[PDB]
Amino acid sequence: NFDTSLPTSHTYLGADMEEFHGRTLHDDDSCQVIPVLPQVMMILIPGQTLPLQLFHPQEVSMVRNLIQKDRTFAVLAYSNVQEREAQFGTTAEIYAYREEQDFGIEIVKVKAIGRQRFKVLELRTQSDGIQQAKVQILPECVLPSTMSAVQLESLNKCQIFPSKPVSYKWWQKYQKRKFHCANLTSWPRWLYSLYDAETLMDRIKKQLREWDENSLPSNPIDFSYRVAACLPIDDVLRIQLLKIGSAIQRLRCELDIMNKCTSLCCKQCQETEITTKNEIFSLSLCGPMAAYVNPHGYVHETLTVYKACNLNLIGRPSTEHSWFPGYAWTVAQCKICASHIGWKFTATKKDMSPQKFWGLTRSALLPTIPDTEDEVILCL
Amino acid sequence: SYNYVVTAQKPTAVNGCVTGHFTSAEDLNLLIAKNTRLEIYVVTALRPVKEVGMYGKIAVMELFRPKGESKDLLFILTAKYNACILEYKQSIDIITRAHGNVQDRIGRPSETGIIGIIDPECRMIGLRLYDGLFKVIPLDRDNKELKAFNIRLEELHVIDVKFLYGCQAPTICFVYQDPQGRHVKTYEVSLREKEFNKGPWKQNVEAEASMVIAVPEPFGGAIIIGQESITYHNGDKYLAIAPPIIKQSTIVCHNRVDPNGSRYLLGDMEGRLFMLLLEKTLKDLRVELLGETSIAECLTYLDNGVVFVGSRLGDSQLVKLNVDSNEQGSYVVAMETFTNLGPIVDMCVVDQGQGQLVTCSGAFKEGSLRIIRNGIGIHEHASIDLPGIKGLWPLRSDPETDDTLVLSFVGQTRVLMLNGEEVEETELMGFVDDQQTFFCGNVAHQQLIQITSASVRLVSQEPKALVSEWKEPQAKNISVASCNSSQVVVAVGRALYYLQIHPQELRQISHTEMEHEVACLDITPLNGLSPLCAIGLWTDISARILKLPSFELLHKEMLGGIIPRSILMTTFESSHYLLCALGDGALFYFGLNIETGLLSDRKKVTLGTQPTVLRTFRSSTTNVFACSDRPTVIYSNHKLVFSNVNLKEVNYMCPLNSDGYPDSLALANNSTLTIGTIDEIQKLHIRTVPLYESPRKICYQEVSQCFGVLSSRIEVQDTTALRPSASTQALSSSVSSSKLEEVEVHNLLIIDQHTFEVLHAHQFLQNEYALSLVSCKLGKDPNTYFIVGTAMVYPEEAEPKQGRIVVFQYSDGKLQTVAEKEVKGAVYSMVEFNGKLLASINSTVRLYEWTTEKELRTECNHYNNIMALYLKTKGDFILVGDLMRSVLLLAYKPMEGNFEEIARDFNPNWMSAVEILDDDNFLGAENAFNLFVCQKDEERQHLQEVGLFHLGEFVNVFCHGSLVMQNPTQGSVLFGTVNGMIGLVTSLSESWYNLLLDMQNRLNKVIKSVGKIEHSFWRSFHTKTEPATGFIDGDLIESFLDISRPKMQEVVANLQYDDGKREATADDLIKVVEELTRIH
Amino acid sequence: IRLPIVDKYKDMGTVVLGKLESGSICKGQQLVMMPNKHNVEVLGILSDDVETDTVAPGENLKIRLKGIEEEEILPGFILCDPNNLCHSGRTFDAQIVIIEHKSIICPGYNAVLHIHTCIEEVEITALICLVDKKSGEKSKTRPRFVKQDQVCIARLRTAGTICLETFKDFPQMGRFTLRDEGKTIAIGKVLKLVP
Ligand SMILES: Cc1ccc(NC(=O)NCc2ccc3c(c2)CN([C@H]2CCC(=O)NC2=O)C3=O)cc1Cl
Ligand SMILES: [Zn+2]
C-alpha cells in the first residue's frame, strides 16, 4: 500500500507554498462582503479542501491582494437553473499560496479550505470580471439532547457515563441510560436513538470503515461536513445538505444516501453503470473523494474506485501532473456516449498497492437507487 | 390565527419537596414544588395553607435561615434562571425580598443539570448552572437584586455538589469525572477573593458514584452514594460499604430524617425505600430495606415517622414507617395517596352529551388509566335500599330543622324519622298513608300539609291531627299540585283551584278552567306569598303565567312540539327566572317579571332525553337540581350555568337539613335513597384504574363499548415478569407466538368502559414493539376494528426493517386477529382516512384500501424527506411531522389516486406533538416546553410561523374535545403533559385577541408576581429567545376575577369596549372573563 | 551539470556568465560546451561578487574558461558534464499552449522561440495532436491548426541549431515560450528531439 496523506497535501502543485496559520471566522448572522472568483463552479463544503490555479490577471490580482487582508473569498452554489441568481454558498480561506512566473505567464496556485455557509443578499459586479457578494453568515443551528427537555432532575446525575473502550453492548448500555426518560414521552429509546448525533456518527463510521483502515472530528458539525464531501452526489442534492442547518439532520440524511445509493452511472446517457459502492475506497485521507486541480486550472472532485465497467482508455499511462504520486493516468471515457468519465490510474512501481484503480470525476456521474421499485432520489 | 391557552388541570407531578419553618417559626411546613406551582402545608400528626404560582419552572427550591431572621426564607431558581428570595406574611402574602435573573451571555448549560445549594451559615447561595463556572450570590442584607459572581472550575464535568457542615469557612464538596476517572474534591470558597482555595481533603471514588450528601455538624463530612458502594469522608477518616441490598438498582433521592443526621432516607429508581444509619464519633454504616413506595422523585421526613414521597411517575404519598415491620413484609405503610396524572403519555375524549377524557398515565408499577369528568361531586353519608320512590319531602315534626323524611310510592306514602344518622319508619298522625303524596311540607300557622291524589290535608303540629281536609267539589282525582308556605294551587287535569292556609282552615278562592290538561304548576314566591302562577298545558304545549286570585296571567309562550314535565320560578344572583323542562329532555329558561308579568330573554338548552324534574335548594345561596338521565345543578355571576352532577341518574330530590345531615341533600333513584352533602363548585373528578404496567396508547371503540390500550411490561431473563399486571391478569388472553437482563413485552389490552376490567390481553411478537393503535370502520364494511402498528426491534439493527399492520376485532368476549400486513419498516402512526387506512412506515406514507376479501390492499405510496412520526388529518389534508420539528402538509388527489405536497416548514427543533387546528393552522409542541403555530397563508408552499408561547410543560398529546356540554371562542384542543397538566387551546376572533392582549398588559401592571418575574419574560418563547405571540394566556386573563374591585377598575381604566364603542367598565370585563372561564 | 551561458565577456583569458541549473561545479573541473563539443577546463569561478572553489546550483557564476573556443561561443549554448552531456540538434516535438492570438496559428507559422539563454527563430512545421484541457484527452484526429486558449502537440524546426532537453528529462532547459511581435504567444514543454 501507499501513503494516504500524500494526495490531500497536493504535492503535484509545487514543492513549497507560503503557509497561513488559520485564523479568521466571522461571527454568526453577520453581513459581510466577500469577493467571488469567476469560473470557479463547485459547491464547497466546510472543511473540504479546494485547490486552485489562476491564469487571468483579473483573478491573479484579486488573490494577490486577498492575501494581505482576509485571505477568504466566496464560493457559490448555483442550481444550473439559476443563471446567476446565486442564493447560498461557502467561505473558503486560503491556507497556502504560491505565485510562479516561471513558464512566463504568471500563475497562482492556492489551497483553500471551506469555512462558513452564507446566504446571498446582493451581488455587485466590480467591472474587473469579479463579483463582490453581500453575504449573511448562516449559524450552525445547535440543539440540546432530545431528553434535556423532559429529563427527570434526579436522573441528571447519571447522564454522564465512563467513556467507551476502543464493544457494542456499550451502545445498548448507552441507549438504555441516555434515553431512559423516553418513558415520560410518547416514543421508544430506539427512536430517540435515530436522532442522536453520537449514534448516527458511529453508524456512519462503520460505512467509512469499509472504505478502510481509519482520528477525525468529535464535533457532529464537522463530522457531518466531512462525510458530506465524501459523498459522490449531484450538484442539486449537494446544495440541499449544505442548506441543512442541523448536524443531526445532516448526519441522518447522509446515512440515507449511503444505504440508498449503491450504483454510480454515466451522468450523460444516464442508464449505464460505471461502478458501485462496493468499489469505493479512500486513497486520500480525506475520503473516497477530494477536489484536485489539473494544470489548466480545472477542478475535479475525483472518486477513487477499485474496479469499474464500460469504459474505454485512450492514449498511454502518464505521470504528468498526477494527483497521486506513484500513479500514472489514462483518460477514461464512456463506452456508449464517449463522454469523459475520469481516469484509470496505474502504478509505476511493482511494489505499490493498488496496481490499478479508477479515479472518476463527480461531474461525469449520476448516483442511482437500484430498481424501478421507488426509483430522482430525495435526501432523507 | 390567534389562540387562547388555558390550564384545565394544574400540574400534579412533584419536582422537589422540603421541610422547615416558613409560615411561622413554631410551625413545621412541607413545601412542595409541582412545576409552576408551590404548595405550602403545615404538618400535623397535612393542613393546606397557601398554594401559589411562579411565572417559572421551579428548578431549585431551598429553605434557609439567614442570621437574625425570625423564620426561614425560601430560595427559588427557575428553569429560565429567575432567582428570588421569598417570605411568608400573615390575610396572606408571599413576598419577594430579593430577585434577579442570573443568566450569563456565554455558558454551556451543564450536562448534570442545574444545582442549587445554600451553605449552613447562610453566607451564600452557590449555583452550578454552566460547565467551568460556579456562581455565588452573597447573602448580604443589602443584596435585593441578587447580583452575583462566578468562580472558574478547572473541572468541567461536575456530577454533584454540596456545601459541608462544620467548616471555619464555606466549603464545597463535589464529585467530578475526567479521563483518569471519578473523584471527590473540596474547595474553600473565599468570599473576599471570590475564588476557590485548596480544600480540606480529596479522593478515585466508585465509577458510578453520583450523589453527594452533606452530613450536619456532629460528624460533619460527606456521604457518597453510587451503584454498588456508599462511602463516607471527612478529612482522612474513610468508610466504604458495598451492601447487596442495594445491588439491584440505583439510589436517586435521599433526605435527612433527624437534625443529628443519625438516619437518612434513600429512594430507589424503581420504588425501594431504604434507611441509612450512621453509627457512633463515626464508626460504621448500615442500610435497611423499608419497602416499596411510589417511584420517588423526592423524599421528606415529616414527623411521628411519617414521610412524604413526592412522585413524578405515580401518585405522591404519605407513608408511615413502623419499627414494627410486619410479616405483611417490610416496615412502610401507606397513609394517603395524592392523585398524579403525570406522564400523560396519550389520551382520548369519549362520550353522549358532555365529553370526558381518558388518559394513559404513569409508568412501570404506577401505570394507570385516568378518567376525568367535569362535574359537581356528591359526598354520600347514607345509602338506603329503598326501591320505588316517586316523590320526596323534608319536614319538621316540631316547631326548627328537618327531622322527618316523607316518601311516596305509587298509591302509597310513608314516613321516615331521622335521629342523627339512623333513619327509622314512623307514622305521621293526620297523614293518610294509602294514597300517593304529591307534595307535603311545613306550612303557615304552626301547621303541616299533605297533598295526595284524593285530598288536600291540613294538619296541626302540637297534638298532630287533621284539622281540615279539602277535596274536589265533585270528589275527583287531583292530577297536579303546588304549594308554598301559605298557599295551594291544585289542578284536576283540565281546570284548577286556588287554596289558602289559615289555622284550622284551608279555604277555597278561585275555580278556573284551562285550554287543556295542565301538566305542571308553580307558586314559588318572589314578599311572603306568591302573587303569580306558572302553568304548563298538555296539548297547547305552552308555559303560561297567570295572576293570583284572578288567573288572567298572559305572556303565554307556546314552546314547540311533547308535554312539559316540570316548571319553576326561581332566583339566581338577584335576577328572576322562570324554568320549564320538557318530556323530551329540553329545558327552556326565560326571564321573569314578578311585577310586570312578561316572560322573555328566551334561551333553551337540552340536558338528556329522559323528562326532567326541577327543585329549589340552598348551598349559602339558592340553586336548582335537575333530575334526569343526567342530573344537573344550576347557577347563577349573571349567567345561568348548568353543571353536570357526578352521579348515575337521580329521579327525585329534596333539600335535607337535620341534626344528623346538616345542609345536606336527599337523592332518590329507582332502587336507592341517598343522603349527601354537595360540593360547590365543579372540579375535575379523576377515577384511577391501576394497570401496574406502562400504558402507551389508548383509543375508543364505542360500538364495543370498550377501550384498546397498548402497553408494555418488564420481564427478566429465562422470560418471567416482576409482578402481576393488567396484561397478565386478563379474563381472556392471547399471544402472537409460542416459545418455539430486562426485556419489554408489548400488549394490546381490551378494557371495558364501565367496569375498567381488562377483558383481553394480546401479546405481540418477541422483539415486536407496538407503536400505533386505532379504532375504525374501513371501506364499506360495517365492522369496527382495532388496528395496531408494530415495528420489529433488534439491538443489532439500529433502524427498524420490518413491522406489521394487524387488524383485530372484538366481538362477543373474544379478540380475533382478522388481517395482517408485513411492511418493510416501522409503523410509527396510523390514522383513519376517509374510510381508507393511512399509515406512516418509516419515511413513507401509505394509504390502504379495505377489500371484501378482508385484507389491506395498498392504493398509494408517498416518500418524504421526513420520517413520518406524527400523523393527523382533516378532510383531504394530511399533517406529517418528525422528531425534528419538520412539518409537511399533504393532499389526497382523488382524481389522481395519489398524494401531493401542499406546504412544508423545516425549522430544526425537537418536536413532541402536533395537531391540526383547521384547514390552515397547525399546532405543535416544541423544544424548551413551547407551543407554536404554523399557518397556510407559487410561494404558497411555505408555512408561516404565526404563534409562539412558552408553556412550561412538555406536551405529549393534542386531541380535539371539550369537558363542558355541547354549545365566543372557536373549536377546542386539549393537551396532555409530562407533568400531568391538562390544557386547552382554542381560536379567538382578531377582535378578542386585540382586547385580551391589552388586558394581559394591564393585568401585568396590577398582579403581584411571585419571584417578581415579568409575565412576558415567562411566556417568551425559549430554547434563542423571542417574545410570545399569537397566544393569550388564559391563566393570566382568568385571574382578573380574583383581584379586588379597585384593581378591576384600575385595569379597565382607559379602554374602548366593543359593541355597536365606549369607556369600558369592570362589569363589562367581569362578564367577558366569565364567558371565558366557561370553556372548561 | 548544466549551465546555460548568458554571455561571454572576453576578459582575462576568457569569461562566461550564467545561472547554474544542473549540479555542482568544482574549480578547474574539465568540461564541454555544446553544440560544438568544445573541451574546456574551469580556471576561475567568480561567483557573485565573491569567488569560491566549488559552487552548487542556483548561484550566479561568472566562470573563466580555457579552451580552443574563447569567444566565437554564443548564448544559448550551455556547459555540459562530458559523461551524460546535453542533447541537441534543431527539430523537436512539444506541447504548446496557445495563450494569446487573434486568429488561427497553423503549421508553418513562424515565430521566435525563447528557450533559456537561447533565442532562435522557429517554425511549427506540423502540429500533431490537439489536447483537451479538462481531461488530458489527446485528440483523435490531427488538427489543421490551433486557436487561442487551446493546447496542441507539435513539432518544431529552429532555422539554425539549439541545445534542447525534454521537459521531465530536464525542466528549465525544456520549458520555453514562443514569442512573436514581442508578445507571448504560447508556452511549451519539449517532449522528444527529432532526429
Ligand atoms: C505550458 C504548459 C501547460 C500545460 C501543459 N500540460 C498540458 O497541457 N497537459 C494536458 C493535460 C490537460 C488536462 C489534464 C492533464 C493533462 C492531466 N489531467 C489530470 C489527470 C489525472 C491527474 O492525476 N492529474 C491531472 O491533472 C488533466 O486534467 C504543459 C505545458 Cl508546457
Ligand atoms: Zn455514457
Identify whether A21 is part of a domain: yes
The coordinates were experimentally obtained by X-ray
**Judgement on whether residues A43 and A86 belong to the same structural domain of the protein:** yes
Domain assignment present for residue A184? The answer is no
Q: Are A89 and A48 in contact (CB under 8 A)?
A: no
Q: Given an 8 Å threshold on Cβ–Cβ distance, is B113 in contact with A143?
A: no
Chain A residue numbers with beta carbons less than 8 Å from the beta carbon of C187 are 103-105
Q: Say how far apart CA C15 and CA C65 lie, in whole Å.
A: 6
User: Residue B510 is inside which H or E element, if any?
Assistant: strand B508-511
Place of cell 473540504: A48
Name the nearest CA neighbour of B291 among B313, B262, B270, B308: B270
Most A-contacting residue of B793, B884, B926 (CB-CB within 10 A), to test interface: B884
Whose atoms come closest to the Cα of A338: which ligand? 2
Mark whether A322 and A346 lie in a shared domain: yes
- Fold topology of B14-340: Methylamine Dehydrogenase; Chain H (2.130.10)
Q: Which residue's CA is the closest to the ligand 1 atom numbered 4? A: A295
* DSSP H helices in C116-185: none
Binding-site residues of A, in ranges, read 266, 269, 321, 323, 329, 334, 337
Helix orientation angle between A169-178 and A197-211, rounded to the nearest 10 degrees: 160
Rounded CA gap, B345 and B955, in Å? Answer: 9
**Angle at B366 (CA atoms; ends B361, B372), nearest 5 degrees:** 35
CATH code 1.10.150.910 for B988-1080: yes
Pocket test for ligand 1, best of C114, C130, C131 (most atoms within 8 A of CB): C131
Alpha-carbon distances of B931 from B13, B302, B538, rounded to whole Å: 20, 38, 55
- Per the CB < 8 A criterion, the answer to whether B23 and B49 are in contact is yes
Contacts of C among chains (3+ CB pairs under 8 A) = A
Q: Which residues of B touch A191 (CB under 8 A)?
A: 869, 883
Say which residue the cell 320526596 belongs to: B392
Instruction: Find where cell 422528531 sits.
Output: B883
Q: Which residues have a Cβ under 8 Å from the Cβ of B938 and sit 6 or more positions away? A: none
Between the alpha carbon of residue B749 and those of residues B695, B696, B699, B713, B722, the distances in Å are 9, 11, 11, 12, 19
Query: Residue B325 Cα, ligand 2 centroid: separation in angstroms?
Result: 85
CA distance to partner chain A, nearest, from residue B632 (Å): 37
Cα separation values, A229 from A246, A254, B266, B383, Å: 16, 10, 53, 79
Of B991, B256, B369, nearest to B706 (Cα)?
B369
Give the whole-angstrom CA distance, residue C135 versus residue C123: 28
Compute, in angstroms, the gap from residue A68 CA to the centroid of ligand 1.
Answer: 30
Compare all CA atoms of chain A with the CA of B910 and give the residue at the minimum distance: A146
Task: Let me know whether A271 and A238 are in one domain.
Answer: no
Residue ranges per domain, chain C? 1-86, 87-195
Q: Cβ(A70)–Cβ(A56) under 8 Å? A: no
Exposed/middle/buried for residue B986 (C-beta within 10 Å: 0-12, 13-18, 19+): buried
3-state secondary structure (DSSP) of residue B312: coil
In the reported structure, the alpha carbon of residue B856 is separated from the centroid of ligand 1 by a whole-number distance in angstroms of 61
Q: In B, which residues are within 8 Å of A152 by CB distance?
A: 297, 312
Helix (H) or strand (E) holding B1067: helix B1066-1077
Find the ligand nearest to A346 CA: 1
> Across the A/C interface, how many CB contacts are shorter than 8 Å?
41
> Among B134, B227, B184, B159, which residue's Cα sits nearest to residue A157?
B159
Q: What is the count of structural domains for chain A?
A: 3
DSSP B428: -
Query: Could you say which of A212, A241, A261 is where a domain stops?
Result: A261
- In terms of phi and psi (left: phi > 0; alpha: psi -120 to 50; beta: otherwise), the region of A247 is alpha
What phi-psi label fits residue B411: left (phi over 0), alpha (psi between -120 and 50 degrees) or beta?
left
Which fold would CATH assign to domain B375-683? Methylamine Dehydrogenase; Chain H (2.130.10)
Separation of alpha carbons B496 and B510, rounded Å: 8
Closest CA to B1066 of B1078, B1079, B1053: B1053
CA angle in degrees (0–180, nearest 5) for A88-A232-A204:
95
Q: Judging by DSSP bridges, how do beta strands C2-8 and C78-80 pair with one another?
A: antiparallel
CA distance B1038 to B928: 25
SS (H, E, C) B175-190: EEEECCEEEEEEEEEE
- Nearest C-alpha neighbor of B789 from the set B888, B917, B877, B699: B699
> Is position A70 within any domain?
yes
Q: Do residues B778 and B821 lie in contact, with contact meaning Cβ atoms separated by under 8 Å?
A: no
Let me know if the fold of C1-86 is the same as that of C87-195: yes
Tell me how far apart the alpha carbons of residues B521 and B566 are, in angstroms, rounded to a whole number. 7
Please, which residues have CB less than 5 A from ligand 2, an ion? A 266, 268-269, 272, 334, 336-337
Q: Domain check: are A134 and A44 in the same one?
A: yes
Mutant choice from B978, B979, B1021, B1022 vs A, greatest count of A C-beta within 10 A: B978
Beta bridge partners of A359: A304, A343
Distance CA(B1041)–CA(B202), nearest Å, equals 57
The protein residue with its alpha carbon nearest to ligand 1, atom 7, reads A295
Task: Establish if B954 touches chain A: CB-CB under 8 angstroms.
Answer: yes
Report CB contact under 8 Å: B16, A253. Answer: no
Q: Which helix (H) or strand (E) holds B416?
A: strand B412-419
Q: Is A69 in the same domain as A123? A: yes
Picking from A154, A203, A204, A153, the residue whose alpha carbon sits closest to that of residue A175 is A203
Query: What residues of B are in contact with residue A157 (Cβ under 8 Å)?
Result: 112, 159-160, 210-211, 252
Together in a domain, A118 and A87: yes
Which of B792, B859, B870, B872 lies closest to B826 in space, CA to CA? B792
* A371 part of contact set with chain B, CB < 8 Å: no
C15 and C3 in contact (C-beta within 8 Å)? no
Backbone angles phi, psi at A36, to 5 degrees: -120, 120
Question: Domain spanning C87-195 has what CATH number?
Answer: 2.40.30.10
C-alpha cell at B580: 320549564
In this structure, what C-alpha cell is assigned to residue B484? 308554598
Please tell me the distance from the alpha carbon of residue B521 to that of residue B536, in angstroms, as a whole number: 7
Q: Given the C-alpha cell 511493482, which residue does it identify?
A: A350
Q: Is A375 exposed, middle or buried (0-12, 13-18, 19+ CB in 10 A)?
A: exposed
CATH of the domain at A32: 2.30.130.40
CA angle, corner B522, sides to B521 and B525, nearest 5? 165
Q: Are A301 and A361 in contact (CB under 8 A)?
A: yes
* Chosen CATH of B1-13+341-374+684-987 out of 2.60.120.380, 1.20.140.10, 2.130.10.10, 3.30.750.24: 2.130.10.10
Location of each CATH 1.10.150.910 domain in chain B: 988-1080
Q: Name the residue among A295, A296, A331 with its Cβ closest to that of C137.
A: A331
User: Among residues A233, A261, A289, which one ends one of the domains?
Assistant: A261
- The answer to whether B905 faces chain A, any CB pair under 8 Å, is no
With CB atoms and an 8 Å threshold, state whether C135 touches A104.
no
Chain B, window 688-747: residues with a beta carbon less than 8 angstroms from a chain A beta carbon:
694, 696
Containing domain of residue A307, as a range?
1-13+262-380
3-state secondary structure of B431: coil
A277 and A337 in a single domain? The answer is yes
Contacts of B894 (CB under 8 A, 6+ apart): B876
Given the C-alpha cell 303540629, which residue does it identify?
B461
Domain C1-86 adopts which CATH fold? Elongation Factor Tu (Ef-tu); domain 3 (2.40.30)
Residue A293 Cα, ligand 1 centroid: separation in angstroms? 9
The set of protein residues with a Cβ atom below 6 angstroms from ligand 1 is: A 103, 294-296, 320-324, 329, 343; C 95, 97, 131, 133, 135-136, 151, 175, 187-189
Number of Cα atoms under 13 Å in the Cβ half of residue B266: 25
**CB pair distance less than 8 Å for C135 and A340:** yes
Strand partners, B124: B138
Determine, yes or no, domain membership for A109: yes
C-alpha cell at A181: 426518560
Q: CB distance A248–B207 less than 8 Å?
A: no
Range list of β-strands (E), chain C:
2-8, 16-19, 25-26, 31-33, 38-45, 54-55, 60-66, 78-80, 89-98, 109-115, 118-131, 150-162, 175-180, 183-190
Residue of B179, B908, B957 lying closest to A143 (CB–CB): B908
On whether both A34 and A128 belong to a single domain, the answer is yes
Number of H helices, E strands in chain B: 5, 90
Assess whether A37 and A100 both reside in one domain.
yes
Cell numbers given for B179: 479521563
* Nearest Cα residue in chain A from C97: A296
β-bridge mates for residue B181, sequence order: B178
Burial A63-84 (b: 16+ CB within 10 A, else e): beebeeebbbbbbbbbeeeeee
- Find the largest Cα–Cα distance for chain A: 73
Closest of C152, C148, C146, C136 to residue C94, by C-alpha: C152
Q: Give first-to-last CA distance, chain A, whole Å.
A: 36
- Closest C-alpha to ligand 1, atom 6: A295
d(CA B442, CA B652): 19
Count CB-CB contacts under 10 A for residue B363.
Answer: 23
For atom 24 of ligand 1, which residue has the closest CA?
Answer: A322
What is the strand order of the sheet B391-395 is part of?
B391-395, B404-409, B412-419, B422-426
Cβ(B165)–Cβ(B172) below 8 Å: no
Q: Can you give C34-81 as a three-state secondary structure string?
A: CCCCEEEEEEEECCCCCCCCEECCCCEEEEEEECCCCCCCCECEEEEC
Beta-carbon separation of A168 and B796 below 8 A:
yes
- At position B527, the amino acid (one-letter code) is N
CATH 2.130.10.10 maps onto chain B at 1-13+341-374+684-987, 14-340, 375-683
- Which residues, in sequence order, are bridge partners of residue C123? C110, C157
Q: Give the annotated binding-site residues of A for Zn(2+).
A: 266, 269, 334, 337
Contact residues, B window 215-254, toward A, CB-based 8 Å cutoff: 250, 252-253
Residue nearest to atom 23 of ligand 1 (CA): A322
Q: How far is the alpha carbon of A280 from chain C, nearest alpha carbon, in Å?
A: 21
C100, C113, C132, C135: best to mutate for the A interface, most A CBs within 10 A = C135
Q: Which helix (H) or strand (E) holds B674?
A: strand B672-678
